[PDB]
């Protein structure tokens, strides 16, 4: 009788060892997965902070730009404003002369 | 011997099976932090997808602007000069309207 129970004491064991080392190998895998998410997520998020730091530059230069530009084309018209105004006036004396001949 | 070895062995399967439950908690501990991580992981790429798209976009911009912002400098400088040339040329006139008089 008690042989018996010592053959399937051994059989349980056995069923026991094969379901370990099931359990184990899988976590063995997913230790493994998790190391590599974690450098990977690592590097994404630096590379997502510098994304973020290069838009809000970007978004600042381009602002700057923007200004830089309207201000010029404000400046343009006022000069070439100037310009035709000399030239009309310039037209007037030259014939204001034309005429004293 | 036997009913002491025996004794023996299920204390051995006992101690087991308590590992066992172990490990079966650590590895859905482990399926669990995994699932978040890919969560946390798809999340974090969708939104480096949207900041690059949004960095490319704005660089565009920024070149563009910058483009406009050059020639108008050019612009500008031409019409200045040809506006001081103009003050001197017109200055030449009325003056050569005075003494004409």
């Given at each position: ?38 450098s990977?997520?690592?590097?994404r ?57």
């Amino acid at each position: 009788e008690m042989a018996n129970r010592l053959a399937g004491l051994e059989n349980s064991l056995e069923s026991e060892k094969v379901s370990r080392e099931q359990l184990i190998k899988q976590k063995d895998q997913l230790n493994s997965l998790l190391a590599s998410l974690e450098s990977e997520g690592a590097e994404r998020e630096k590379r997502l902070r510098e994304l973020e730091a290069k838009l809000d530059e970007t978004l600042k230069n381009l602002e700057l730009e923007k200004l830089a530009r309207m201000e010029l084309e404000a400046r343009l018209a006022k000069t070439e404003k100037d310009r035709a105004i000399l030239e009309l006036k310039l037209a007037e004396a030259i014939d204001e002369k034309s005429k004293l001949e």
